């Protein structure tokens, strides 16, 4: 078995490896790179998203999200409060603030220490699932806005033709902005690719014991617990590494830089927060071997954790029995 111990795995395609997305996902996962949940890869040093991105700021933030904690340090929720539209002139000015920028610090690791000590003391504003892309239209390799989509892939491997569509999301972080612990809807994949800025640290947990998370987060989060029975699908709860270590959850680590892309793969819980002011942009995907992951997916009947217009045919065609309920919540 490769990978045995669920490393996080680095990859460094040629130019060449770069052309075939389906091929070299399934490469990586040849060496057992989805046993990690999380993978790192490094394009090419010909390749390039675009040109420049010198002419940025006059997108729209519609709703910008202040994120407010609640709890201990290594033990918290957030919530989502709106706040005004902003351009992402603005937004990266805010981000440039005395209030908001990032500390002198050492190295990762110090602001790391930094992030986990104080994170909860301050509530920084987030630019999150913006939808649209920043890849240049004449970029052929891994253009995030150009894959293949789920519902072509459902149709391959299963036959069956669906409504909806699949289209990427941008994300623009400041420092503390915070990605709370989760799967991907349906426990699809997810790509992210760093368009610039500064950098982004995971965690992650091996797919193989994503149950062990859920137990822990039951237990953290009690009266969360009791009012929803998959609850990490809020995408609310944070649990630091020193709390993860006290209580033996297995997980890994990477700081991902302007750049690089990464990969989660199904079921694999992630966390994570920004280093200062940066834009990412990610979309889940589909592999054949994703299909037994969408059938098993838990899902939020509570309705608090309300998706997508394309979810409805996943959840209708992989898991019948759901249907019904599952749409009682979004309704
Ligand atoms: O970058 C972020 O804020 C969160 N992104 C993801 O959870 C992802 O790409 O799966
Ligand atoms: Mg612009
Ligand atoms: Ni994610
Ligand atoms: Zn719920």
């Given amino acids: 078995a490769q990978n045995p111990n669920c490393n996080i795995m680095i990859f460094h395609?040629?130019?060449?490896?770069?052309?075939?997305?389906?091929?070299?996902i399934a490469y990586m996962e040849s060496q057992g790179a989805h046993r990690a949940g999380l993978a790192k890869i490094i394009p090419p040093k010909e390749w390039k998203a675009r040109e420049t991105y010198?002419?940025?700021?006059?997108?729209?933030?519609?709703?910008?999200?202040?994120?407010?904690?609640?709890?201990?340090?290594?033990?918290?929720?957030?919530?989502?409060?709106?706040?005004?539209?902003?351009?992402?002139?603005?937004?990266?000015?805010?981000?440039?603030?005395?209030?908001?920028?990032?500390?002198?610090?050492?190295?990762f690791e110090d602001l790391e220490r930094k992030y986990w000590k104080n994170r909860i003391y301050n509530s920084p504003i987030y630019g999150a699932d913006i939808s649209g892309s920043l890849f240049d239209e004449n970029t052929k390799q891994w253009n995030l806005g150009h894959l293949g989509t789920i519902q072509d892939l459902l149709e391959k491997e299963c036959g069956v033709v669906i409504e909806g569509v699949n289209t990427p999301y941008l994300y623009?972080?400041?420092?503390?902005?915070?990605?709370?612990?989760?799967?991907?809807?349906?426990?699809?994949?997810?790509?992210n690719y760093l368009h610039?800025?500064?950098?982004?640290?995971?965690?992650?947990?091996?797919?193989?014991?994503?149950?062990?998370?859920?137990?822990?987060?039951?237990?953290?989060?009690?009266?969360?617990?009791?009012?929803?029975?998959?609850?990490?699908?809020?995408?609310?709860?944070?649990?630091?590494?020193?709390?993860?270590?006290?209580?033996?959850?297995?997980?890994?680590?990477?700081?991902?830089?302007?750049?690089?892309?990464?990969?989660?793969?199904?079921?694999?819980?992630?966390?994570?927060?920004?280093?200062?002011?940066?834009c990412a942009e990610a979309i889940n995907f589909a592999t054949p071997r994703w299909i037994d992951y969408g059938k098993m997916a838990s899902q939020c009947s509570c309705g608090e954790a309300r998706v997508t217009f394309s979810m409805d045919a996943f959840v209708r065609i992989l898991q019948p029995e759901r249907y019904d309920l599952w749409k009682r919540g979004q309704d």
């Avoid at 809807?185 to 997810?190: A, E, F, Q, T």
């Fill in 13 to 24: 395609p040629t130019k060449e490896e770069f052309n075939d997305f389906d091929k070299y």
């Fill in 54 to 107: 010198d002419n940025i700021s006059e997108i729209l933030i519609a709703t910008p999200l202040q994120q407010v904690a609640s709890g201990r340090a290594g033990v918290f929720t957030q919530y989502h409060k709106k706040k005004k539209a902003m351009t992402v002139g603005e937004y990266r000015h805010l981000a440039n603030s005395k209030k908001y920028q990032t500390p002198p610090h050492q190295n």
């Fill in 172 to 191: 623009f972080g400041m420092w503390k902005t915070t990605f709370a612990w989760h799967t991907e809807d349906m426990d699809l994949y997810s790509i």
């Fill in 196 to 278: 610039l800025g500064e950098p982004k640290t995971w965690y992650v947990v091996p797919p193989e014991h994503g149950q062990r998370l859920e137990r822990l987060a039951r237990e953290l989060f009690p009266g969360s617990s009791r009012g929803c029975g998959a609850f990490l699908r809020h995408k609310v709860a944070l649990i630091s590494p020193t709390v993860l270590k006290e209580n033996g959850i297995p997980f890994n680590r990477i700081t991902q830089e302007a750049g690089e892309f990464m990969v989660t793969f199904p079921y694999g819980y992630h966390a994570g927060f920004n280093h200062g002011f940066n």
